[PDB]
Structure 1
Amino acid sequence: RVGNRYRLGRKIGSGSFGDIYLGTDIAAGEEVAIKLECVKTKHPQLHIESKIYKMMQGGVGIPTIRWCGAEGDYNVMVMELLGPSLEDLFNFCSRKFSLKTVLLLADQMISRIEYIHSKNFIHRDVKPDNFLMGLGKKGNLVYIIDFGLAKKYRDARTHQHIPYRENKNLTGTARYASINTHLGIEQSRRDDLESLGYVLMYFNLGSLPWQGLRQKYERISEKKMSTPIEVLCKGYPSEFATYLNFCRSLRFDDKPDYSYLRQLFRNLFHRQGFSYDYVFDWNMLKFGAS
C-alpha cells in the first residue's frame, strides 16, 4: 500500500531517475501510475520533478497528480494512468506512421512543448517515449511526461532568459538531441522543438540515419552534423525541412513562433486532403487468428 488510497503493484518501467509502478486507487477503484525513488540516493530529484508537475497542472495534456509524498524508503508520486507512448504505438504500427498520423501528432506535440515553455521550463528530453496517449474519452489527446531533465529557461518574476552558456553535461536521449546539446551548448526553447523535428522524421522514416552506430554519443553527433536536412527529409513534404531549419536557426533566447510552426503542418494537412476525424494509424490495425 502507498499513501492513503493507493495500493502498489508491478514495476512497469523506468523513468528518468526513478522506477514506475502500477497502482490501484482503493476509493474510486480506478488504476493509477506510481513513481518511486529511493530516499537515500545522494542525488534526490523526485521532489523537484513533482513541483514541476504541479506547476504544469491544469494544462492540456499534462497528467493529473493524484498524490505525492513519502513511504518507507521511497519518495512517491501518483499519476493518473495514461495509454501507451508514441514509441509503443510506433512499434505496434510496424515502425511506420502515415503522413496523416504524423501531422496529427505534430500539432499536439508542438502545443505541449509550447505550454511547458509558457511555464518557464524546457523539457530537454523530447522523445517518443515521453509522449503518452490518453485513455477513454482522451484517447486522442497526446500527453507529455518525464520532467526529470527539465530546467528553467527564464526567471518567473522577470522572464529574463538564461544567459548563453556552455553546458557539456549531455542530458537527454542522444538520438533526438539537438545539435546544440552535442556541441555542449545550454539548451533553450529552440532545442525542444528541434528535437521534436527529429522525432517527426523518425516517425516518417522509421529510423533516423544516425541510429545503430560515450563513444556512440560522438558518432551520433558526427553523423547528425554530416546530415543535411535536404538529405534527411528527402522524399517527404518540404514543411518538415522548413520546420527543422526554423528551429536550428532560431536565436538562443528567441521565443519560437509556435503558431507558424503548427500552421506549417496544418496547411499541409489541408492541402493533402486529409480528413480531420482524429483517426490514427493504430485505429486502423486489423486482427484475427494466428
Structure 2
Amino acid sequence: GSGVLMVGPNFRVGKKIGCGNFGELRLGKNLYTNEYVAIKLEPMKSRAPQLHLEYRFYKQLGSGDGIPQVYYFGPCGKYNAMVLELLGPSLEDLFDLCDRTFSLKTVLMIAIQLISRMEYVHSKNLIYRDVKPENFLIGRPGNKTQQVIHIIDFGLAKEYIDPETKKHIPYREHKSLTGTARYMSINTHLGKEQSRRDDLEALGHMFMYFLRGSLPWQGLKADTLKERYQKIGDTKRATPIEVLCENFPEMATYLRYVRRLDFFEKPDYDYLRKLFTDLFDRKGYMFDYEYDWIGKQLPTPV
C-alpha cells in the first residue's frame, strides 16, 4: 500500500542510475543515517545468479582501501538486493570527459593504485577476472575518497587458492570466453584458466588503452562472439609489445613481464609499482591526485 520499495529495515530504493544495467543499479538512501547508497538488484528469477556470492566475495575481501563498503544483502520485492557505498563516475566516464585520452601522469597515478588494488584482491585469495574502465570508480565529491580509485563488480571473481587444500587452482584449458574481449589477456583468449597474471595483463592493456586513446584490436567484428574473440586474440598476438607500447618503455616492460608470468606464479607487485613510480619521479610528476578530470564536472545521481 506504500508503493515504495525498501531494502532491509532502512534503505529506500530510488531511481535507477548509470548506463546499461536496465534497472540493475539504483540510487538508494539510508533513511536512518540520511546518506545515499548504491543498490545493486538482481531478479530472484535470474537464470545466472551472481549477486549473493558477489556479496560473499565482498565478505571475504573485508574492509579495504579502494573496496566499496557493503551494507546489506536482502530481498526486495522480486529482487535480491545488495546495498553498497555510493561511489563516483568510472574511469570510462572520466575518459570520455577527458576526450578519450589520459596524460601519462594520470595513467601512472591510476596504474600505481590499481596494481596495489589487485594485489589486495589477490592477497584475499581472489582473482578479479573483469578488468575494464567501467569497473573502476573514483569516490564522491566530499566523502573523503573521491580521489581514490575503487574496484567494483566482483561477479566474475574466483578463489584461486582452494580454501581446504590451500593449493593454487589447477591449470586447465577450454574455459568458455565471456569477459570483455578488448582488455583480456592473450592466454584468456586461448581458453586457459585465468590466474593472477591475467588480472595484471588486463590492467596493462587498459593502461595502454588510456594512453593511446584506443587499442589496435578494438574495432574487430565477426559473425559469432567466438570468432570475434579469436580475431581480437590473433591481433593481440600479432601486435608486438614494442609497437603497442611505442613511446612508453615502462609500459612495454610491465606488459611483457606479466605476459611471461607462469600460471601459478606470484607477481612481483613491488617490481611493477617501482617501474611506474621510478618513471613517475623521473618525469618530475607529483603524486597529488590531480588527474586530468579535475575542475571538470562529473555526473552524480544525487
Provide the TM-score with structure 2 as the length reference. 0.90
CA RMSD of aligned residues (A): 1.8
Corresponding position of 2:153: 146
Corresponding position of 1:189: 196
- Over 3 Å counting, the alpha-carbon distance change for 1:285 and 1:170 in structure 2 is same
Corresponding position of 1:128: 133
Quick one: percent identity of the two aligned structures?
59
> Offset at 1:46?
1.1
> Offset at 1:96?
1.2
Decide whether the 8 Å contact of 2:7 with 2:74 is kept in 1. Answer: no
Q: Does the residue aligned with 1:283 lie in a helix, a strand or coil?
A: coil
Corresponding position of 2:242: 230
- Looking at structure 2, the residues matched to 48 and 30 of structure 1 have their Cα atoms a distance apart, in angstroms, of 25
Q: Does the residue aligned with 1:44 lie in a helix, a strand or coil?
A: coil
Decide whether the 8 Å contact of 1:25 with 1:32 is kept in 2. Answer: yes
Counterpart AA for 1:74: Y
Counterpart AA for 1:185: K
Corresponding position of 2:79: 74
**Aligned mate of 1:163, from 144, 158, 170:** 170
Decide whether the 8 Å contact of 1:149 with 1:171 is kept in 2. Answer: no
Counterpart AA for 2:183: Y
Query: CA-to-partner distance for each residue in 1:24-60, whole Å, 9 max, x for gaps?
Result: 1111111100011111223322111100011112111
- Over 3 Å counting, the alpha-carbon distance change for 1:285 and 1:42 in structure 2 is closer
- Looking at structure 2, the residues matched to 255 and 169 of structure 1 have their Cα atoms a distance apart, in angstroms, of 24
Corresponding position of 2:99: 94
Q: May I ask how many residue pairs the two structures share in their alignment? A: 286
Counterpart AA for 2:117: R
Decide whether the 8 Å contact of 1:17 with 1:37 is kept in 2. Answer: no
Provide the TM-score with structure 1 as the length reference. 0.94
* Larger displacement relative to structure 2 (82-91 or 207-216): 207-216
Corresponding position of 1:25: 30
- Looking at structure 2, the residues matched to 55 and 37 of structure 1 have their Cα atoms a distance apart, in angstroms, of 21
- Looking at structure 2, the residues matched to 216 and 275 of structure 1 have their Cα atoms a distance apart, in angstroms, of 41
Counterpart AA for 1:232: L
Decide whether the 8 Å contact of 1:17 with 1:148 is kept in 2. Answer: no
Corresponding position of 2:185: 178
Counterpart AA for 1:163: P
- Looking at structure 1, the residues matched to 36 and 114 of structure 2 have their Cα atoms a distance apart, in angstroms, of 25
Decide whether the 8 Å contact of 2:186 with 2:236 is kept in 1. Answer: yes
Q: Does the residue aligned with 2:218 lie in a helix, a strand or coil?
A: coil
* Larger displacement relative to structure 2 (206-215 or 174-183): 206-215
Corresponding position of 1:259: 270
**Aligned mate of 1:61, from 60, 63, 66:** 66
Q: Does 2:284 match 1:273?
A: yes
Decide whether the 8 Å contact of 1:13 with 1:19 is kept in 2. Answer: no
- Looking at structure 2, the residues matched to 148 and 277 of structure 1 have their Cα atoms a distance apart, in angstroms, of 32
Q: Does 2:52 match 1:41?
A: no
Decide whether the 8 Å contact of 1:67 with 1:78 is kept in 2. Answer: yes
> Offset at 1:176?
0.3
Query: CA-to-partner distance for each residue in 1:243-283, whole Å, 9 max, x for gaps?
Result: 00010000000100001000110000001111222211111
List runs of 5+ in structure 1 lacking aligned partners. Answer: none
Counterpart AA for 2:178: T
- Looking at structure 2, the residues matched to 271 and 123 of structure 1 have their Cα atoms a distance apart, in angstroms, of 31
Counterpart AA for 2:256: N
